Design an enzyme around this catalytic site. Structure first.
Site, PDB file in Angstrom:
ATOM      1  N   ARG A 156      57.981 -31.330  74.564  1.00  0.00           N
ATOM      2  CA  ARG A 156      58.474 -30.077  74.020  1.00  0.00           C
ATOM      3  C   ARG A 156      58.276 -30.221  72.524  1.00  0.00           C
ATOM      4  O   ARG A 156      58.683 -31.243  71.963  1.00  0.00           O
ATOM      5  CB  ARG A 156      59.946 -29.903  74.274  1.00  0.00           C
ATOM      6  CG  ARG A 156      60.569 -28.635  73.722  1.00  0.00           C
ATOM      7  CD  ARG A 156      60.804 -27.743  74.909  1.00  0.00           C
ATOM      8  NE  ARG A 156      61.988 -26.934  74.725  1.00  0.00           N
ATOM      9  CZ  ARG A 156      62.238 -25.871  75.491  1.00  0.00           C
ATOM     10  NH1 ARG A 156      61.424 -25.481  76.470  1.00  0.00           N
ATOM     11  NH2 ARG A 156      63.335 -25.181  75.258  1.00  0.00           N
TER      12      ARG A 156
ATOM     13  N   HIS B 223      53.787 -21.748  76.556  1.00  0.00           N
ATOM     14  CA  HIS B 223      54.973 -22.155  77.261  1.00  0.00           C
ATOM     15  C   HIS B 223      54.659 -21.984  78.736  1.00  0.00           C
ATOM     16  O   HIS B 223      55.363 -21.262  79.438  1.00  0.00           O
ATOM     17  CB  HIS B 223      56.133 -21.264  76.819  1.00  0.00           C
ATOM     18  CG  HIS B 223      57.476 -21.742  77.332  1.00  0.00           C
ATOM     19  ND1 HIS B 223      57.816 -22.921  77.844  1.00  0.00           N
ATOM     20  CD2 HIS B 223      58.595 -20.965  77.317  1.00  0.00           C
ATOM     21  CE1 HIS B 223      59.096 -22.883  78.129  1.00  0.00           C
ATOM     22  NE2 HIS B 223      59.559 -21.699  77.810  1.00  0.00           N
TER      23      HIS B 223
ATOM     24  N   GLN C 112      57.203 -21.844  81.857  1.00  0.00           N
ATOM     25  CA  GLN C 112      58.063 -20.677  81.992  1.00  0.00           C
ATOM     26  C   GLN C 112      57.447 -19.624  82.894  1.00  0.00           C
ATOM     27  O   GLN C 112      58.059 -19.129  83.835  1.00  0.00           O
ATOM     28  CB  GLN C 112      58.309 -20.057  80.625  1.00  0.00           C
ATOM     29  CG  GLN C 112      59.232 -18.853  80.603  1.00  0.00           C
ATOM     30  CD  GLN C 112      60.657 -19.208  80.959  1.00  0.00           C
ATOM     31  OE1 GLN C 112      61.247 -20.059  80.303  1.00  0.00           O
ATOM     32  NE2 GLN C 112      61.297 -18.644  81.966  1.00  0.00           N
TER      33      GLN C 112
ATOM     34  N   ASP D 185      62.699 -11.524  74.544  1.00  0.00           N
ATOM     35  CA  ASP D 185      63.069 -12.837  74.042  1.00  0.00           C
ATOM     36  C   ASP D 185      63.671 -12.705  72.658  1.00  0.00           C
ATOM     37  O   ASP D 185      63.637 -11.637  72.050  1.00  0.00           O
ATOM     38  CB  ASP D 185      61.833 -13.706  73.984  1.00  0.00           C
ATOM     39  CG  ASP D 185      61.997 -15.195  73.725  1.00  0.00           C
ATOM     40  OD1 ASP D 185      63.102 -15.740  73.683  1.00  0.00           O
ATOM     41  OD2 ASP D 185      60.961 -15.825  73.578  1.00  0.00           O
TER      42      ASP D 185
ATOM     43  N   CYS E 113      63.752 -15.241  79.371  1.00  0.00           N
ATOM     44  CA  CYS E 113      63.632 -16.671  79.567  1.00  0.00           C
ATOM     45  C   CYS E 113      64.865 -17.465  79.171  1.00  0.00           C
ATOM     46  O   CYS E 113      65.110 -18.565  79.655  1.00  0.00           O
ATOM     47  CB  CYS E 113      62.448 -17.194  78.780  1.00  0.00           C
ATOM     48  SG  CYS E 113      62.465 -16.839  76.999  1.00  0.00           S
TER      49      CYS E 113
ATOM     50  N   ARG F  26      62.979 -22.088  87.240  1.00  0.00           N
ATOM     51  CA  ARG F  26      62.364 -23.031  86.327  1.00  0.00           C
ATOM     52  C   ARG F  26      62.193 -24.412  86.947  1.00  0.00           C
ATOM     53  O   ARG F  26      61.140 -25.035  86.805  1.00  0.00           O
ATOM     54  CB  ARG F  26      63.201 -23.213  85.092  1.00  0.00           C
ATOM     55  CG  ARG F  26      63.362 -22.030  84.161  1.00  0.00           C
ATOM     56  CD  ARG F  26      62.103 -21.675  83.391  1.00  0.00           C
ATOM     57  NE  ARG F  26      61.425 -22.834  82.842  1.00  0.00           N
ATOM     58  CZ  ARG F  26      61.673 -23.371  81.644  1.00  0.00           C
ATOM     59  NH1 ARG F  26      62.589 -22.898  80.796  1.00  0.00           N
ATOM     60  NH2 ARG F  26      60.977 -24.444  81.297  1.00  0.00           N
TER      61      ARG F  26
HETATM   62  N1  LIG Z   1      60.258 -18.102  72.042  1.00  0.00           N
HETATM   63  C1  LIG Z   1      61.445 -18.820  72.466  1.00  0.00           C
HETATM   64  C2  LIG Z   1      61.240 -19.327  73.905  1.00  0.00           C
HETATM   65  C3  LIG Z   1      62.433 -20.054  74.519  1.00  0.00           C
HETATM   66  C4  LIG Z   1      62.095 -20.642  75.879  1.00  0.00           C
HETATM   67  N2  LIG Z   1      63.300 -21.034  76.584  1.00  0.00           N
HETATM   68  C5  LIG Z   1      63.345 -22.095  77.384  1.00  0.00           C
HETATM   69  O1  LIG Z   1      62.385 -22.842  77.579  1.00  0.00           O
HETATM   70  C6  LIG Z   1      64.694 -22.309  78.039  1.00  0.00           C
HETATM   71  P1  LIG Z   1      65.447 -23.801  77.378  1.00  0.00           P
HETATM   72  O2  LIG Z   1      65.516 -23.715  75.781  1.00  0.00           O
HETATM   73  O3  LIG Z   1      66.936 -23.999  77.938  1.00  0.00           O
HETATM   74  O4  LIG Z   1      64.587 -25.064  77.811  1.00  0.00           O
HETATM   75  C7  LIG Z   1      61.756 -19.982  71.528  1.00  0.00           C
HETATM   76  O5  LIG Z   1      60.869 -20.792  71.248  1.00  0.00           O
HETATM   77  O6  LIG Z   1      62.899 -20.053  71.075  1.00  0.00           O
END
Ligand SMILES: N[C@@H](CCCNC(=O)CP(=O)(O)O)C(=O)O
Ligand SMILES: N[C@@H](CCCNC(=O)CP(=O)(O)O)C(=O)O
Ligand SMILES: N[C@@H](CCCNC(=O)CP(=O)(O)O)C(=O)O
Lengths: 333, 333, 333
Positions: free
Chosen positions: C106, C133, C136, C231, C273, C319
């Site tokens: 990540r 990503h 997702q 988002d 997401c 997920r």
């Molecule tokens: N564009 C957003 C995407 C978040 C994706 N969320 C996830 O993968 C869920 P998690 O944070 O619980 O792993 C960002 O980068 O903030």
């Protein structure tokens, strides 16, 4: 044999025979895992892993080696638990010993891990302390042995350039004292290891057929080496201020190509416990590289790091087999 | 019995019978592990562990107890995940409930863990909150029971000196309300627990044959105690500023030798949930010790901590059997 | 099939057939776990999980999916190891590849995970990078498929309001290019995705029967949608300063009730997401809500988030099945 429930704090608490047995077990375990015939020995054992300084290899090594052997792990990283300090290590030990079967400790200063070992009543392994780093040398010894087969350790010449008074320098001494390696610490005098330890280890090395040479001359030190080895000039836990004086002292001890050439052996292999600031890619790597002008490597040139002589990643792999060995030796049968 | 899928947030959500059953299961599980006859019950269950304050014992306890029972664990420490806060606990709960079989929570304030329990749809256990700490008392109850066999809890006198309005004080009240212990909270009035809770718990304690006495007098409080118990004067999460006023209030309530002597019982045993600032060895231990002059112990003298009366490490061990019990009770059959 | 030892870095490195196979396996694995007939495939495999940005879902997902499949995990969180930066990712990769069977990453920027994949010599999965990503979208695709059965993806209309040039916007494009979804990116022009990628993906989408429409008009964009998706307006890793201009641009693109009504489909389901700033409950949620005046939701109104249309928690559950699928596909047989 006389390994069950023993701690692993520094190498000199072991006989040459013990070290060699250990090395042998590690080698078996390595071989067993590649063949897929690995018989798990540590099933149902729980191990705590105290880390006060950072780590990629040592932590990962402890984790996978345990997982392979059927044990589980609890990582108490730098500040998360009460051990950070708000509680005595003496208390911490006595607590953890009641729950776990073994404890690893990475930290600052041997007093800590020794106190941790008196009171825990379970095997305590030294993940790296300020003075020693025994686990590393096990791996390095084996890696050295795997690249020069049919050679006893007393037939090998190992040179260590750089800061000879860090935990790695100190550990070299112990290694030689137990193996009869022809140790050569090429360093400025200001960075030489404490003389009391040199003397003790020299005496022991010579008994086993080796000799610990200390010298500021690069040229007579590296000559005939089978291995060149080095490490970062400022270690974990030392003040950021040290960088300016350590670069000043140690830059002529950089392991570069010319350095590898003065050896005279074209089969000489390079070793480095890692992390290594070898390129102008990192965070403080680039900052240090422009400022002082170490373009293309500090302790080691990037050309040498990516050289065919570099066997650092083999070395690195050997960290975990070695640790697996320590753990099955102190926890099983 | 009426344990499967129940949460464990505070002790008063349980009957005396339930508490006692629990205590009994814990005792079995302890015994099974020492005999090596431990039958794993939680195989293939995954448990999340949310920690917002530090922990050595409670975390380790949850980890090994799960590993023994064949479960796996995910530690979401203080800031690493989104739960730190950037996301509702309400959302967090609903997320984690979809993946895990149980959730532990260590944190700030009962509202949080209650909200976490409404929405998660899986058992939520309180690892310590600002107000309660139920898991501790389970362990303490059993440890008390193991050191005075053939004694019902109503036949025991427990004294708690120190800050009686922290999470530990509050928890004492619940314990007594369920066991009929002769609770004695020896504390300054400024640190007495909230009266509404005292009243409720007193009423319940008396029904079961106990009585909750609150008193600023050390001498009449400690008299005839089977156990003296204490805790740090400033708890996790309270402001650093509190130290100066809490020392001012509580230092005459230090559990020292004279203190243990006013008891009159020579068999009196000392208890402390830990961490304990008992020596001039720690980080803020030494800083507090010189400044205010608590030389050789703050809540407890080092002499008493290392006394034969001290059974804190037994107590500490009993944290994990107790937690194992809570988990097999809420997750199995 | 052509999955074993493949990396999972972005969706366009896969064929429509591959994506669909994957989606199918995920669906099986989900179903197997609920029926209790889950056959573990990844037994004895060790997986490293590098996290440089926060995560609740993606981390938890990787952990439980591995634990179910009999694998173990090592979480190298943001600063704990040497990977934080003090060491090349190139070195890190080469180290970890010698110990683990797979690596998750990540972080910040696709260069990193690509470099990590060249050098590791084990499968590298993208946990979220700045640009893509992929993981997702797998989950979202399946969740979309589970709520409109008997519909091929080319028969579905998906609208994405909000910041269309974040990692999620970019990922939408890939998804459509592979599924023939009728993608609609309702966003201000200032937030439109890079045209080179739009063109490539549009061409591919149309081949499969879809079309990528970009438009600043909310009303013609949302019309006839089967799904509205959005988002956070500032993503992880972007500067805090961006909030003031992003709110300025994007607030008319809030997914509110009126927004859901302009769709015209009463069966339209909302997707997000997560994390989502939908209420005046959070840390920076409340601070942003008073300051700019986003009372009751920023990207999405709390009314819509808790609406019957909201299927975000199903999405969220999906997920982990999706990730389990990726892992058994790249590591087994
Ligand atoms: N564009 C957003 C995407 C978040 C994706 N969320 C996830 O993968 C869920 P998690 O944070 O619980 O792993 C960002 O980068 O903030
Ligand atoms: N003298 C150096 C030694 C580093 C040892 N390296 C390791 O053990 C490898 P790791 O950091 O990945 O565990 C120092 O203290 O900085
Ligand atoms: N009132 C004290 C209670 C500490 C409880 N201790 C424990 O639970 C032992 P641990 O910190 O090792 O988990 C406080 O809040 O500081």
């Amino acid at each position: 044999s006389g390994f069950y429930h023993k701690h692993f704090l520094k190498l000199l608490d072991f006989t040459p025979a013990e070290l060699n047995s250990l090395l042998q077990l590690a080698a078996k375990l390595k071989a067993d895992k590649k063949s897929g015939k690995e018989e798990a020995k540590l099933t149902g054992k729980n191990i705590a892993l105290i880390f006060e300084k950072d780590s990629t290899r040592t932590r990962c090594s402890f984790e996978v080696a345990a997982y392979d052997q059927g044990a589980r792990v609890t990582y108490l990283g730098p500040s998360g638990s009460q051990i950070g300090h708000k509680e005595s290590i003496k208390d911490t030990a006595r607590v953890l010993g009641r729950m776990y079967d073994g404890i690893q400790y990475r930290g600052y200063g041997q007093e800590i891990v020794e106190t941790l070992a008196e009171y825990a009543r379970v095997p305590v392994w030294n993940g790296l302390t300020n003075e020693f780093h025994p686990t590393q040398l096990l791996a390095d010894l084996l890696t050295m042995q795997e690249h020069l087969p049919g050679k006893a350790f007393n037939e090998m010449t190992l040179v260590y350039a750089g800061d000879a008074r860090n935990n790695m320098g100190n550990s070299m001494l112990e290694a030689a004292a137990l193996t009869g390696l022809d140790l050569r610490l090429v360093a400025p005098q200001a960075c030489w290891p404490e003389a009391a330890l040199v003397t003790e280890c020299r005496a022991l090395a010579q008994q086993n057929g080796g000799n610990i040479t200390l010298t500021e001359d690069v040229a007579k030190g590296v000559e005939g080496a089978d291995f060149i080895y080095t490490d970062v000039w400022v270690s974990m836990g030392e003040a950021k201020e040290k960088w300016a004086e350590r670069i000043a002292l140690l830059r002529e001890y950089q392991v570069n190509s010319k350095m590898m050439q003065l050896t005279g052996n074209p089969e000489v292999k390079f070793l480095h416990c890692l992390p290594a600031f070898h390129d102008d890619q990192t965070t403080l790597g680039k900052k240090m590289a422009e400022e002082f002008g170490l373009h293309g490597g500090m302790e080691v040139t990037d050309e040498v790091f990516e050289s065919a002589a570099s066997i650092v990643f083999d070395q690195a792999e050997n960290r975990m087999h070695t640790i697996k060995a320590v753990m099955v030796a102190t926890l099983s049968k």
